[PDB]
Design a protein around this ligand. Sequence first.
Ligand SMILES: Oc1ccc(/C=C/c2cc(O)cc(O)c2)cc1
Length: 483
Amino acid sequence: KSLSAAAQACVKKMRDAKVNEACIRTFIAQHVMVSKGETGSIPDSAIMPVDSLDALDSLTIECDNAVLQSTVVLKLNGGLGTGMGLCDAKTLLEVKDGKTFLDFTALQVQYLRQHCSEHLRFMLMDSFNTSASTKSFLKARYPWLYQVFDSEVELMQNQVPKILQDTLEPAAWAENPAYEWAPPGHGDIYTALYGSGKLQELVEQGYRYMFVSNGDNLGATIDKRVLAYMEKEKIDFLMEVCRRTESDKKGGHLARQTVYVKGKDGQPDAEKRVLLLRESAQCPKADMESFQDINKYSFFNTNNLWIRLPVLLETMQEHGGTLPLPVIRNEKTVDSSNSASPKVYQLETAMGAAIAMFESASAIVVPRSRFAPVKTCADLLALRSDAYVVTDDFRLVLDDRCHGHPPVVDLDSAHYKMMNGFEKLVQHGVPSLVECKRVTVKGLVQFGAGNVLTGTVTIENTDSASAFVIPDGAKLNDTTASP
Ligand SMILES: Oc1ccc(/C=C/c2cc(O)cc(O)c2)cc1
C-alpha cells in the first residue's frame, strides 16, 4: 500500500463504517500531507496583494431566464446554533415573522421558479445533526421540497476520523464513540458532490452554474447580474468578497500568487497567476502584522461562491476524483470539554480555497448587505425589529427610514449571549429599532410592549439581580435608563 499503519487503520475504520470511497480517497491524501510534516505556512513572500477588482454595484446587465434554468442554489446547512445557545440547526431559528433562514431561502427559490425559471434547483448540505430537523421542517411547510428531499434536495456531509497527535492513528473514545468522528469543514462540499454522484447527475442533466452560500447568511440571494458577468467574462469560479474593516483584521483575506506548473505528459510547463485565501493559522508569526493591514490586503471571502459545474467535474476528474485543498490541522481533544482526553487532529478544508484550482477564476467586491450572518442575539434583535422589511420577492432589507444604516445593538453577556436569556427579553414584545442609532444594554433587562428606541440609548443595571422591567409604551430618546 505504501500507506503507513496509521493510514491503513484509518482506511479500515472508514471501510468498516461504510464511508464512501471518494471521502476515504480524499482524507488519506490529507493524512499523507500531514504525516510528511507539512507546515502549510503561507508567508508574505509567497503571496502578493490583489490590488483591484470589479464591483457588483458597478454592474447593470442581468442574465436572461435561460441561465437560471441551468442554475442550482445550494445552502450550507450542517451547522448548529451552538454559538448562540441553540443545540439544533441554525437555519431553523426564527428571523422575522415566524419565518426562519430556511423559510426565506425556500420562498426566494419559490418566487424565482414561479416568475423566472421553473427548473431552478435547490439543494441543502446537511450533517447528521441537522438532517432530521430539516426534513421534518420541510415536511410541514414546503411539501414540494419534502417529496424530493431524499432524492434531489439533500447533500449529506461526510465525517472523517479524528487522529491522534503523536501517532496519527484513528483516535478512540469508548465513553462516546461518536466523538471519534468529525465533519471535515465546508470544503467537503466538492467531495460530497462528486462521491455521491450528484455532480455528474447535475452536469448530464444540463445544469451549468451552482451558487453556494452559508445557510445563515440572509444576504446571499440570487443576483442575475453576477451570472451575466460570468457568462460575459468566461468565469469558472467567482468569489464574492467584501472590504475588510478593523473588526475583520483577524479573519482571512484574499491574495494573489504566481505558480510554475511542471507540464504533465507531453505538454509544456506553465506559469500563471492564481487567487487564494490566507487565514491566521496559515500566516507565519512574523507576518501577522501584515496579515492585519486592511489597507494591504483589503478583501475577505463571504462564502458566496458561483461555480461552473462542468468545469468542476473535469477538474476533480483530473485529480483522481478529488479536489486537493489546503488542509487545516485543528488541534483539540477527542472530547473538547474533557481536557484530559487524547489530543487529536481534526483535518478540515475550506470551500473558498478552491479558487486556486481554476484557470478562469475571479473575485468581485460586493456590498456588505450580501454578507449579513446572524452570529449574536444582538444581530437577531435588529432583524426581528421593524428596522427590517420583507420585499415582494422575499428578501430582507432595511426600511428606508434607517437610510442604509442598521441600528447597532450591543447586549450584555449577562443574560444575553444565549437564546434562553434573549427569549425573556422579548417575552411580551420587540422594541422598535428603526430610529435607534445604537443601543447598549447592561445587566438584566426586560422589554414591555410597544417600546421604541431613538438615537443612542443605554440601559444599565448595576448588579441589582432583580427584575428591572421597562413599561409598556415607553420610548427612550438619546438617554440612559437606570432603575
Ligand atoms: O445595499 C448595500 C448594503 C451595504 C452597503 C455597504 C457595503 C460595504 C461593502 C464593503 O465591501 C465593505 C463595507 O465595510 C461595506 C452597500 C449597499
